[PDB]
From a paper:
In order to elucidate the role of the flexible loop (Gly123-Leu138) in metal binding and laminin binding, a construct (ΔLmb) was made, replacing the loop region with a short linker (PGATV) and its structure was determined by molecular replacement using wt Lmb as a model. On comparison with wt Lmb, the backbone structure of ΔLmb including the regions at either ends of the deleted loop remains unaffected. These two structures superpose with an rms deviation of 0.4 Å for 247 Cα atoms. Surprisingly, the ΔLmb structure showed the presence of bound zinc, in contrast to two other deletion mutant structures of SBPs, namely ZnuA-Se and ZnuA-Syn, which were devoid of metal ion at the active site. However, only the primary zinc binding site has been located and no such secondary site is observed in Lmb, possibly because of the absence of histidines in the loop, which cannot coordinate an additional zinc ion. Another notable feature in ΔLmb is the packing of the two monomers in the crystallographic asymmetric unit which is different from that of the wt Lmb. In ΔLmb, the truncated loops of the two molecules face each other and form the interface. In contrast, in wt Lmb, the two monomers are oriented such that the loops face away from each other. A similar difference in the packing of the monomers in the crystal lattice was observed between wt and ΔZnuA-Syn. It is noteworthy to mention that both wt and ΔLmb exist as a dimer in solution, as shown by gel filtration experiments, although the physiological relevance of such a dimeric assembly is not known. Our data conclusively shows that the loop spanning residues Gly123-Leu138 do not play a significant role in metal acquisition and the interaction with laminin.
Numbering used by the authors: 32 to 124, 136 to 306
């Protein structure tokens, strides 16, 4: 079987679709707050009793690097799936990086390819089945990429505002510009200064939709929206496990579809 643990939805969906039915994948945190998530002794115990723990990046789940198998006498394989990927710093001249690479199809696709290389490396008797499921996912990912890259070039509106800075990589890939009401994390709420900057930014680029998210309180988003004449819609950074039973990419497609509609 091989027990695979996973940090949050994105990691869960990529490792699962790539694993198929071969293993038993579980998710540590399915709720919200991955940014401020901190494991319980039950959680780490779970990680250690696992054969494989998959997480996104130390820049997000910093707690993960604190995990030490050799010491705890565990046979677990801690794997940081975005390690090969290169993160943009949050601000020009800043020691911190933006971890929201999964909302960008291409990076998501290649993160899933790295995850499959791990599964294959830890379970050689199925190495073929893994890379086979990864190519499919990545191919779809490119398919999804080619699609929206066309839809967006046919939209003259390019800017949108989101609840928190979680779509920089998605925007960057489709030639769109974004600004987050909050920072890399939803807890990093705006001072009265930034609010007015968000406002003047909305006015500057005639942004007509402020995208809130199910994870946080839309008060501030509604506020800005009422003061700048823009309306509020919901856009998911996929940090929380989506309702329904769509594929990861299907879930992503649905989100950049609303993006395309609001922007046109
Ligand atoms: Zn985030």
């Amino acid at each position: 079987g091989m027990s695979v643990v996973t940090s949050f939805y994105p990691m869960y969906a990529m490792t699962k679709e790539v694993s198929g039915d071969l293993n038993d994948v579980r998710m540590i945190q399915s709720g919200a707050g991955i940014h401020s998530f901190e494991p319980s002794v039950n959680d780490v115990a779970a990680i250690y009793d696992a054969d494989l723990f998959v997480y996104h990046s130390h820049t997000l789940e910093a707690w993960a690097r604190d995990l030490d198998p050799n010491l705890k006498k565990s046979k677990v394989n801690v794997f940081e799936a975005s390690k090969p990927l290169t993160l943009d710093r949050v601000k020009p001249g800043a020691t911190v990086y933006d971890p929201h690479t999964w909302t960008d199809p291409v990076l998501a696709g290649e993160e899933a390819v790295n995850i499959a290389k791990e599964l294959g490396h830890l379970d050689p008797k199925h190495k073929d089945s893994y890379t086979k499921k990864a190519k499919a996912f990545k191919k779809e990912a490119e398919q999804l990429t080619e699609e929206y890259t066309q839809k967006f070039k046919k939209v003259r509106s390019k800017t949108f505002v989101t609840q928190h800075t979680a779509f920089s990589y998605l925007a960057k890939r489709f030639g769109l510009k974004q600004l987050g009401i909050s920072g890399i994390s939803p807890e990093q709420e705006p001072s009265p200064r930034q609010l007015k900057e968000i406002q003047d930014f909305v006015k500057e680029y005639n942004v007509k939709t402020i995208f809130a998210e199910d994870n946080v309180n839309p008060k501030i988003a509604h506020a800005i929206a009422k003061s700048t004449g823009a309306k509020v819609k919901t856009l998911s950074p996929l940090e929380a496990a989506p309702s329904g039973n769509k594929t990861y990419l299907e879930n992503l497609r649905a989100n950049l579809e609303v993006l395309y509609q609001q922007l046109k």
